[PDB]
């Protein structure tokens, strides 16, 4: 019960999935021409999770990438490693979803998705130990928010016993690429909360801030950000695919980290956040990774942690680590950071140990937690709606297809309910 | 009434078992693959025992009789890819392939009992393989839900099938300071009722105390789980001291429940092992049994985060290995009584079970415990863990105010009545703990 | 009533202890690492003693039973990185890690007593290790605040725990000419009251007199602290002369307080050692015990910057080692009485305790003291240090006019009442010093 099928959709989702693919093929070791490079055994049975054995000792991915623009796959098969992708994995159409929610999946997005569901079924009986479903998409993007939720609907319909993992990128409330980006984001979360079991809060501006703070990056490139998020995504499952003291699974995240399926929003933090030029001057140890974990400028929600409080926090450690260091540092943080932990657990902690070291580093970890700071982003988006959308400007583009104000009022009620849940559970 | 069957559940229990069979191979002279290499004694089997834990193959091989049940195949693969493959029968290694929780969410429910039939059939076949049956050994972690759930299910199953064999459970308790996962207290207490109704003798071990003694006594800056496994492996294998080696006054397994447990009531004795010293401190200490007993009475060596000297006296057993003198130990215990220790009860009124074993104490080369000419294993059903369950129960009350988990717990089929019943059972157990010493 | 436990506090006390155990290894034939190398006698243990200061390990090793308590880790590291590591148990070396003063500002207050619990537990365990307990040896410097404060705290603690054992304190007093640091008189006198209320026998040693005799008797242009440590090491180890070696008339530790101290009053005898000569002056001197006693009566050899001949007589003890004749020493003491020395009291009225020891006097190779066939250690509770405390008290009055330190002293929790009480206690002690000789 380990195999994972990686679903990719949206403009940003394709890049994130591709970068995740190069990170995977580099962390376990596999050249693009079909040459075995695992060392020695543990890197062979665990690659069945993402790849399947083809003829002549060839390994090919089991991943359905879907997008209405076919220009991204050209920059995948001829670019860096995507040559393993079988031609049937390319499900693309013409020409775009319109960068909106009314045309994303309501009328035209429901045509080829039947074939998508059929190929998902055929991969399902082609798979033996299907475990989870990984989706990468954009919350405000037309394609990702458009058919992503409807794919979630089908994957719930056909698999009532399989949980769903979503990693949508949340647009910042201060950057507006288009006037209807938060509109599409909220029209997507209208069904995301009713169809998903857990999700991660990803903000590009937080990535820019961490690049200009620690990385000192001069050129704003989405490739480095994809590399970082893909390293985080690999790290959250290294515990499952590499045994340790306590292996962690997505269902274990649902049981422990999630307080109830209604509240499933998480902020992501990664460590170590070091760049070239500081590698010969730091000692990479568990305590340093810990102060980098609870540092207020290291998560990518991105909100303020010490102005609110946490509800439950988790640690997913990687590499050769002793049991005493991590628990001693956890005693230290529980002693000094006791005020911001909830007074009913009372020890907000979930630990997981990974054996192999991260690629390009020695010791690393990921941060998953629940705080009361996401309701601030929700009320910011709601206030943006209550300000801009009361004029009913450019709103006919969606009501032309049969949209009613009842759906928007229900979404506002949903975000009010989410805020109230974030206040139960007071800040 | 000859053989003892050991079952390990959970990753921690599997590690403890691996360590303990490594030791068993060490003192009894079995190579890490078996057959032989070579046989030593006289007495190690023949004459019996063995066989007591290792099956005596007709070809001359030695096969441990253990069943590895777990739903996480990684532990079974780690056992099978190492030197342990030549010790365990292929059918005895029950490898699981279903992972949905770790594990008490579904372990103690209908999800586990369609596999329990095969486990019961296998253990019945193994019992029919050997001549007679004496008792069972349990090694599971109450933190990991796999151990709690599956071990408890096996407990009721094998209490139903025989109901006449001794039940020894070495359960790893979650650290009372902090818990590695939040659901561990549920995994412990929702099975404490089954343990109360379906156990004969339970041993409590705490990882925090082992780490404390590793930091202090062993002077190890970074203790490892392997060191804990080795230490509790000697603790288990010295019980289990006269059952495999000759002694002037051997101790029987039934004797423990005849003397320590005179009621249908509390049967949960503590354990302690001493002396505990490193290889560098063996050039300065040659103490007698009195100081070893004093170290046993120390809270740090009791494997419980409490004060055993603040409790009330209960019947205890003293097991001695190596070169010991009965007059010396009588003098030591009389001095301990003179120091006005834990309040003696009027029902025994003073009972000190003394066990003498000829074999010298043994230590693991993988551990930093120096070999000593005399060691003490002390077993006592002291009421000093009552405040430990009280602290766990206060945690229970504070995290049961919101109940925090009843969503999934009810969704799978349970309800708050079971939690309330476990709460009142724990309260009754604490009240009995107070009363059994308050009567005197 | 068999073993003596020694505790050293402060850097000076640790150096003195290091020197004294180096000697103890020298005469009793223990190599600088122990075990053995080899055993000598017959009598050195067995028969007892030892064990008197060195623990008799079952393996045959010899382990000094001392506790090194200090808040400055540098001294403990210096002890642990040398040959002393094989003599002291790792748990007996209490290394401190907190440095905020040196040390009486916080030593004699709440800062020190959260560590004193561990020290008391360790010394109780060590006492339980051995059979019986006779007395305690103290080596601390009244100049360094660590010695004063921690030693006094241990004094009240161990006077409370037993209250029946002899208390011997070798306290290093600050030089009466100049003080190395200004706070040393406080460190001395604020604990003089605790010493008065919680001591049985205190020995006064002055570094200035040792330096004076090193410059004059030893002809050393640059005396070192090591030479002082070695000299007072022989002084201590000759007391402590018949307790480890055979003698015609052995002297008991209780005898000192039976004869020298007939009251609940002054119990602070002086000490003196002689002959004191270099390796180049051993080719011209073969004097008898009379001149050695005369050298003992000299102010320079009394380890006090005062005139012992200007005081009044008090009961004294004379300890003799090597080849001595009772008729010779009786003639010598009768001559001393004939010379009209310090005014004899009418209460004894004339008591000369004579101790004879068979073992020859011993000297340190690190020191320039030549080995002699006969030596004298003289103990007397003469009232001649009264003007020494008077000079210290005049210093106290002049630096208490402004009080100079009461800012911090009150800020940590004290007040001028304690200083006034210590002042009047010292005045009462001086008045008793005058009166005990004025009564006769």
PDB file of C-alpha atoms in Angstrom, chain C residues 175-385:
ATOM      1  CA  UNK C 175      47.881  36.462  55.587  1.00  0.00           C
ATOM      2  CA  UNK C 176      47.601  39.010  58.438  1.00  0.00           C
ATOM      3  CA  UNK C 177      50.177  41.319  56.825  1.00  0.00           C
ATOM      4  CA  UNK C 178      48.341  41.825  53.517  1.00  0.00           C
ATOM      5  CA  UNK C 179      45.308  40.177  51.943  1.00  0.00           C
ATOM      6  CA  UNK C 180      45.291  38.941  48.358  1.00  0.00           C
ATOM      7  CA  UNK C 181      41.677  40.120  48.016  1.00  0.00           C
ATOM      8  CA  UNK C 182      39.690  42.549  50.142  1.00  0.00           C
ATOM      9  CA  UNK C 183      36.676  40.277  50.786  1.00  0.00           C
ATOM     10  CA  UNK C 184      38.734  37.511  52.445  1.00  0.00           C
ATOM     11  CA  UNK C 185      38.187  38.843  56.013  1.00  0.00           C
ATOM     12  CA  UNK C 186      34.426  38.690  55.411  1.00  0.00           C
ATOM     13  CA  UNK C 187      34.718  35.162  54.011  1.00  0.00           C
ATOM     14  CA  UNK C 188      36.553  34.196  57.206  1.00  0.00           C
ATOM     15  CA  UNK C 189      34.604  35.960  59.946  1.00  0.00           C
ATOM     16  CA  UNK C 190      31.065  35.598  58.562  1.00  0.00           C
ATOM     17  CA  UNK C 191      31.744  31.846  58.868  1.00  0.00           C
ATOM     18  CA  UNK C 192      33.694  32.006  62.148  1.00  0.00           C
ATOM     19  CA  UNK C 193      30.337  31.922  63.956  1.00  0.00           C
ATOM     20  CA  UNK C 194      29.291  28.757  62.114  1.00  0.00           C
ATOM     21  CA  UNK C 195      32.716  27.285  62.885  1.00  0.00           C
ATOM     22  CA  UNK C 196      32.280  28.095  66.581  1.00  0.00           C
ATOM     23  CA  UNK C 197      28.820  26.515  66.674  1.00  0.00           C
ATOM     24  CA  UNK C 198      29.565  23.530  64.403  1.00  0.00           C
ATOM     25  CA  UNK C 199      33.200  22.426  64.835  1.00  0.00           C
ATOM     26  CA  UNK C 200      35.081  20.123  67.205  1.00  0.00           C
ATOM     27  CA  UNK C 201      38.749  20.759  66.336  1.00  0.00           C
ATOM     28  CA  UNK C 202      40.087  23.432  63.975  1.00  0.00           C
ATOM     29  CA  UNK C 203      43.695  23.811  62.817  1.00  0.00           C
ATOM     30  CA  UNK C 204      45.049  27.237  61.853  1.00  0.00           C
ATOM     31  CA  UNK C 205      47.666  27.504  59.094  1.00  0.00           C
ATOM     32  CA  UNK C 206      49.185  30.716  57.714  1.00  0.00           C
ATOM     33  CA  UNK C 207      50.836  30.967  54.302  1.00  0.00           C
ATOM     34  CA  UNK C 208      53.078  33.828  55.453  1.00  0.00           C
ATOM     35  CA  UNK C 209      54.808  31.694  58.096  1.00  0.00           C
ATOM     36  CA  UNK C 210      55.319  28.843  55.618  1.00  0.00           C
ATOM     37  CA  UNK C 211      56.883  31.288  53.161  1.00  0.00           C
ATOM     38  CA  UNK C 212      59.043  32.696  55.970  1.00  0.00           C
ATOM     39  CA  UNK C 213      60.386  29.262  56.899  1.00  0.00           C
ATOM     40  CA  UNK C 214      60.897  28.399  53.218  1.00  0.00           C
ATOM     41  CA  UNK C 215      62.988  31.554  52.805  1.00  0.00           C
ATOM     42  CA  UNK C 216      64.882  31.020  56.077  1.00  0.00           C
ATOM     43  CA  UNK C 217      64.976  27.305  56.920  1.00  0.00           C
ATOM     44  CA  UNK C 218      64.715  25.950  53.365  1.00  0.00           C
ATOM     45  CA  UNK C 219      66.938  28.711  51.890  1.00  0.00           C
ATOM     46  CA  UNK C 220      64.545  28.875  48.921  1.00  0.00           C
ATOM     47  CA  UNK C 221      64.642  32.300  47.208  1.00  0.00           C
ATOM     48  CA  UNK C 222      61.298  31.743  45.416  1.00  0.00           C
ATOM     49  CA  UNK C 223      58.993  29.495  47.466  1.00  0.00           C
ATOM     50  CA  UNK C 224      56.066  27.989  45.584  1.00  0.00           C
ATOM     51  CA  UNK C 225      52.544  27.060  46.631  1.00  0.00           C
ATOM     52  CA  UNK C 226      53.454  23.423  45.939  1.00  0.00           C
ATOM     53  CA  UNK C 227      56.106  23.562  48.670  1.00  0.00           C
ATOM     54  CA  UNK C 228      53.521  24.915  51.122  1.00  0.00           C
ATOM     55  CA  UNK C 229      51.111  22.148  50.118  1.00  0.00           C
ATOM     56  CA  UNK C 230      53.780  19.482  50.648  1.00  0.00           C
ATOM     57  CA  UNK C 231      54.826  20.874  54.040  1.00  0.00           C
ATOM     58  CA  UNK C 232      51.280  21.021  55.372  1.00  0.00           C
ATOM     59  CA  UNK C 233      50.797  17.583  53.793  1.00  0.00           C
ATOM     60  CA  UNK C 234      53.466  16.125  56.076  1.00  0.00           C
ATOM     61  CA  UNK C 235      51.925  18.123  58.931  1.00  0.00           C
ATOM     62  CA  UNK C 236      48.534  16.518  58.245  1.00  0.00           C
ATOM     63  CA  UNK C 237      49.952  13.033  57.596  1.00  0.00           C
ATOM     64  CA  UNK C 238      51.815  13.002  60.939  1.00  0.00           C
ATOM     65  CA  UNK C 239      48.648  13.245  63.090  1.00  0.00           C
ATOM     66  CA  UNK C 240      47.484  10.641  61.569  1.00  0.00           C
ATOM     67  CA  UNK C 241      50.862   9.137  62.500  1.00  0.00           C
ATOM     68  CA  UNK C 242      49.846   6.176  64.688  1.00  0.00           C
ATOM     69  CA  UNK C 243      46.484   5.589  62.969  1.00  0.00           C
ATOM     70  CA  UNK C 244      48.174   3.855  60.010  1.00  0.00           C
ATOM     71  CA  UNK C 245      51.419   2.537  61.553  1.00  0.00           C
ATOM     72  CA  UNK C 246      52.263   0.573  64.681  1.00  0.00           C
ATOM     73  CA  UNK C 247      53.439   2.403  67.781  1.00  0.00           C
ATOM     74  CA  UNK C 248      54.259   1.699  71.406  1.00  0.00           C
ATOM     75  CA  UNK C 249      51.608   4.190  72.603  1.00  0.00           C
ATOM     76  CA  UNK C 250      49.113   4.986  69.853  1.00  0.00           C
ATOM     77  CA  UNK C 251      47.084   8.201  70.042  1.00  0.00           C
ATOM     78  CA  UNK C 252      43.346   8.169  69.342  1.00  0.00           C
ATOM     79  CA  UNK C 253      41.387  10.913  67.604  1.00  0.00           C
ATOM     80  CA  UNK C 254      38.906  11.137  70.484  1.00  0.00           C
ATOM     81  CA  UNK C 255      41.807  11.538  72.924  1.00  0.00           C
ATOM     82  CA  UNK C 256      42.510  14.970  71.418  1.00  0.00           C
ATOM     83  CA  UNK C 257      39.105  16.319  72.427  1.00  0.00           C
ATOM     84  CA  UNK C 258      39.145  14.436  75.740  1.00  0.00           C
ATOM     85  CA  UNK C 259      42.405  16.005  76.944  1.00  0.00           C
ATOM     86  CA  UNK C 260      42.910  19.235  74.972  1.00  0.00           C
ATOM     87  CA  UNK C 261      39.257  20.315  75.236  1.00  0.00           C
ATOM     88  CA  UNK C 262      37.770  19.818  78.737  1.00  0.00           C
ATOM     89  CA  UNK C 263      34.933  22.340  78.206  1.00  0.00           C
ATOM     90  CA  UNK C 264      32.180  23.187  75.712  1.00  0.00           C
ATOM     91  CA  UNK C 265      34.642  26.032  75.065  1.00  0.00           C
ATOM     92  CA  UNK C 266      37.698  26.853  72.937  1.00  0.00           C
ATOM     93  CA  UNK C 267      38.840  23.910  70.796  1.00  0.00           C
ATOM     94  CA  UNK C 268      41.269  25.495  68.303  1.00  0.00           C
ATOM     95  CA  UNK C 269      44.754  24.044  68.851  1.00  0.00           C
ATOM     96  CA  UNK C 270      47.884  25.197  67.073  1.00  0.00           C
ATOM     97  CA  UNK C 271      50.197  22.855  65.179  1.00  0.00           C
ATOM     98  CA  UNK C 272      53.940  22.842  64.530  1.00  0.00           C
ATOM     99  CA  UNK C 273      56.332  20.535  62.692  1.00  0.00           C
ATOM    100  CA  UNK C 274      60.081  20.146  63.173  1.00  0.00           C
ATOM    101  CA  UNK C 275      62.934  19.645  62.394  1.00  0.00           C
ATOM    102  CA  UNK C 276      62.807  21.754  59.222  1.00  0.00           C
ATOM    103  CA  UNK C 277      66.039  21.541  57.218  1.00  0.00           C
ATOM    104  CA  UNK C 278      67.187  21.289  53.615  1.00  0.00           C
ATOM    105  CA  UNK C 279      69.100  18.502  51.869  1.00  0.00           C
ATOM    106  CA  UNK C 280      72.373  20.450  52.208  1.00  0.00           C
ATOM    107  CA  UNK C 281      72.064  21.047  55.974  1.00  0.00           C
ATOM    108  CA  UNK C 282      71.623  17.334  56.769  1.00  0.00           C
ATOM    109  CA  UNK C 283      75.419  16.890  56.942  1.00  0.00           C
ATOM    110  CA  UNK C 284      75.795  19.093  60.036  1.00  0.00           C
ATOM    111  CA  UNK C 285      72.741  18.539  62.289  1.00  0.00           C
ATOM    112  CA  UNK C 286      71.998  15.460  64.409  1.00  0.00           C
ATOM    113  CA  UNK C 287      70.174  17.184  67.259  1.00  0.00           C
ATOM    114  CA  UNK C 288      68.050  15.538  69.943  1.00  0.00           C
ATOM    115  CA  UNK C 289      64.360  16.096  70.678  1.00  0.00           C
ATOM    116  CA  UNK C 290      65.035  19.054  73.002  1.00  0.00           C
ATOM    117  CA  UNK C 291      66.175  21.347  70.189  1.00  0.00           C
ATOM    118  CA  UNK C 292      63.321  20.104  67.991  1.00  0.00           C
ATOM    119  CA  UNK C 293      60.866  21.107  70.727  1.00  0.00           C
ATOM    120  CA  UNK C 294      62.642  24.465  71.006  1.00  0.00           C
ATOM    121  CA  UNK C 295      62.195  24.941  67.251  1.00  0.00           C
ATOM    122  CA  UNK C 296      58.515  24.070  67.689  1.00  0.00           C
ATOM    123  CA  UNK C 297      58.234  26.798  70.342  1.00  0.00           C
ATOM    124  CA  UNK C 298      59.736  29.311  67.897  1.00  0.00           C
ATOM    125  CA  UNK C 299      57.150  31.772  66.508  1.00  0.00           C
ATOM    126  CA  UNK C 300      58.348  31.169  62.948  1.00  0.00           C
ATOM    127  CA  UNK C 301      57.505  27.453  63.061  1.00  0.00           C
ATOM    128  CA  UNK C 302      54.045  27.867  64.639  1.00  0.00           C
ATOM    129  CA  UNK C 303      52.305  28.785  61.339  1.00  0.00           C
ATOM    130  CA  UNK C 304      50.982  31.965  62.979  1.00  0.00           C
ATOM    131  CA  UNK C 305      52.324  35.531  62.830  1.00  0.00           C
ATOM    132  CA  UNK C 306      52.406  35.956  66.602  1.00  0.00           C
ATOM    133  CA  UNK C 307      54.479  35.039  69.645  1.00  0.00           C
ATOM    134  CA  UNK C 308      53.368  31.714  71.187  1.00  0.00           C
ATOM    135  CA  UNK C 309      55.720  32.247  74.144  1.00  0.00           C
ATOM    136  CA  UNK C 310      53.864  35.423  75.178  1.00  0.00           C
ATOM    137  CA  UNK C 311      50.618  33.512  75.753  1.00  0.00           C
ATOM    138  CA  UNK C 312      49.457  31.347  78.635  1.00  0.00           C
ATOM    139  CA  UNK C 313      49.880  27.588  78.895  1.00  0.00           C
ATOM    140  CA  UNK C 314      47.167  25.184  77.760  1.00  0.00           C
ATOM    141  CA  UNK C 315      47.018  21.403  77.448  1.00  0.00           C
ATOM    142  CA  UNK C 316      49.258  20.217  74.616  1.00  0.00           C
ATOM    143  CA  UNK C 317      50.069  17.027  72.716  1.00  0.00           C
ATOM    144  CA  UNK C 318      53.521  15.871  71.582  1.00  0.00           C
ATOM    145  CA  UNK C 319      53.748  13.298  68.778  1.00  0.00           C
ATOM    146  CA  UNK C 320      57.050  11.553  68.053  1.00  0.00           C
ATOM    147  CA  UNK C 321      58.110   9.466  65.051  1.00  0.00           C
ATOM    148  CA  UNK C 322      61.167   7.327  64.411  1.00  0.00           C
ATOM    149  CA  UNK C 323      63.811   6.500  67.022  1.00  0.00           C
ATOM    150  CA  UNK C 324      62.854   8.244  70.277  1.00  0.00           C
ATOM    151  CA  UNK C 325      63.510   7.589  73.966  1.00  0.00           C
ATOM    152  CA  UNK C 326      60.919   8.283  76.659  1.00  0.00           C
ATOM    153  CA  UNK C 327      63.549   9.275  79.228  1.00  0.00           C
ATOM    154  CA  UNK C 328      65.017  11.774  76.752  1.00  0.00           C
ATOM    155  CA  UNK C 329      61.654  13.391  76.025  1.00  0.00           C
ATOM    156  CA  UNK C 330      60.745  13.495  79.727  1.00  0.00           C
ATOM    157  CA  UNK C 331      64.062  15.238  80.399  1.00  0.00           C
ATOM    158  CA  UNK C 332      63.408  17.664  77.535  1.00  0.00           C
ATOM    159  CA  UNK C 333      59.905  18.602  78.691  1.00  0.00           C
ATOM    160  CA  UNK C 334      61.128  18.964  82.285  1.00  0.00           C
ATOM    161  CA  UNK C 335      63.837  21.337  81.043  1.00  0.00           C
ATOM    162  CA  UNK C 336      61.212  23.302  79.099  1.00  0.00           C
ATOM    163  CA  UNK C 337      59.146  23.606  82.279  1.00  0.00           C
ATOM    164  CA  UNK C 338      62.287  24.705  84.141  1.00  0.00           C
ATOM    165  CA  UNK C 339      62.941  27.502  81.623  1.00  0.00           C
ATOM    166  CA  UNK C 340      59.749  29.263  82.863  1.00  0.00           C
ATOM    167  CA  UNK C 341      57.774  29.112  79.628  1.00  0.00           C
ATOM    168  CA  UNK C 342      54.132  30.185  79.118  1.00  0.00           C
ATOM    169  CA  UNK C 343      52.333  30.492  82.452  1.00  0.00           C
ATOM    170  CA  UNK C 344      51.006  27.098  83.517  1.00  0.00           C
ATOM    171  CA  UNK C 345      47.333  26.961  84.469  1.00  0.00           C
ATOM    172  CA  UNK C 346      46.083  25.451  87.726  1.00  0.00           C
ATOM    173  CA  UNK C 347      43.333  23.362  86.089  1.00  0.00           C
ATOM    174  CA  UNK C 348      45.396  20.675  84.339  1.00  0.00           C
ATOM    175  CA  UNK C 349      47.771  21.718  86.080  1.00  0.00           C
ATOM    176  CA  UNK C 350      50.607  20.316  83.941  1.00  0.00           C
ATOM    177  CA  UNK C 351      49.622  17.945  81.151  1.00  0.00           C
ATOM    178  CA  UNK C 352      52.064  16.856  78.431  1.00  0.00           C
ATOM    179  CA  UNK C 353      50.506  14.247  76.147  1.00  0.00           C
ATOM    180  CA  UNK C 354      53.334  12.161  74.663  1.00  0.00           C
ATOM    181  CA  UNK C 355      52.853  10.112  71.508  1.00  0.00           C
ATOM    182  CA  UNK C 356      55.393   7.561  70.260  1.00  0.00           C
ATOM    183  CA  UNK C 357      55.338   6.177  66.713  1.00  0.00           C
ATOM    184  CA  UNK C 358      57.600   3.480  65.290  1.00  0.00           C
ATOM    185  CA  UNK C 359      57.563   4.587  61.649  1.00  0.00           C
ATOM    186  CA  UNK C 360      60.384   6.935  60.600  1.00  0.00           C
ATOM    187  CA  UNK C 361      59.487  10.480  59.523  1.00  0.00           C
ATOM    188  CA  UNK C 362      58.889  10.856  55.790  1.00  0.00           C
ATOM    189  CA  UNK C 363      59.520  13.732  53.382  1.00  0.00           C
ATOM    190  CA  UNK C 364      58.331  14.653  49.901  1.00  0.00           C
ATOM    191  CA  UNK C 365      60.780  14.351  46.973  1.00  0.00           C
ATOM    192  CA  UNK C 366      59.041  17.390  45.443  1.00  0.00           C
ATOM    193  CA  UNK C 367      59.949  19.366  48.589  1.00  0.00           C
ATOM    194  CA  UNK C 368      63.417  20.250  49.872  1.00  0.00           C
ATOM    195  CA  UNK C 369      62.889  18.690  53.320  1.00  0.00           C
ATOM    196  CA  UNK C 370      65.628  16.217  54.220  1.00  0.00           C
ATOM    197  CA  UNK C 371      64.618  12.852  55.653  1.00  0.00           C
ATOM    198  CA  UNK C 372      65.236  12.755  59.410  1.00  0.00           C
ATOM    199  CA  UNK C 373      65.330   9.880  61.894  1.00  0.00           C
ATOM    200  CA  UNK C 374      63.118  11.734  64.405  1.00  0.00           C
ATOM    201  CA  UNK C 375      60.480  14.460  64.064  1.00  0.00           C
ATOM    202  CA  UNK C 376      58.079  16.305  66.369  1.00  0.00           C
ATOM    203  CA  UNK C 377      54.507  17.400  65.674  1.00  0.00           C
ATOM    204  CA  UNK C 378      53.249  19.603  68.519  1.00  0.00           C
ATOM    205  CA  UNK C 379      49.580  20.453  69.084  1.00  0.00           C
ATOM    206  CA  UNK C 380      48.614  23.121  71.619  1.00  0.00           C
ATOM    207  CA  UNK C 381      45.523  25.276  72.165  1.00  0.00           C
ATOM    208  CA  UNK C 382      47.566  28.317  73.122  1.00  0.00           C
ATOM    209  CA  UNK C 383      45.798  31.671  73.486  1.00  0.00           C
ATOM    210  CA  UNK C 384      48.492  33.489  71.463  1.00  0.00           C
ATOM    211  CA  UNK C 385      46.356  33.942  68.323  1.00  0.00           C
TER     212      UNK C 385
END
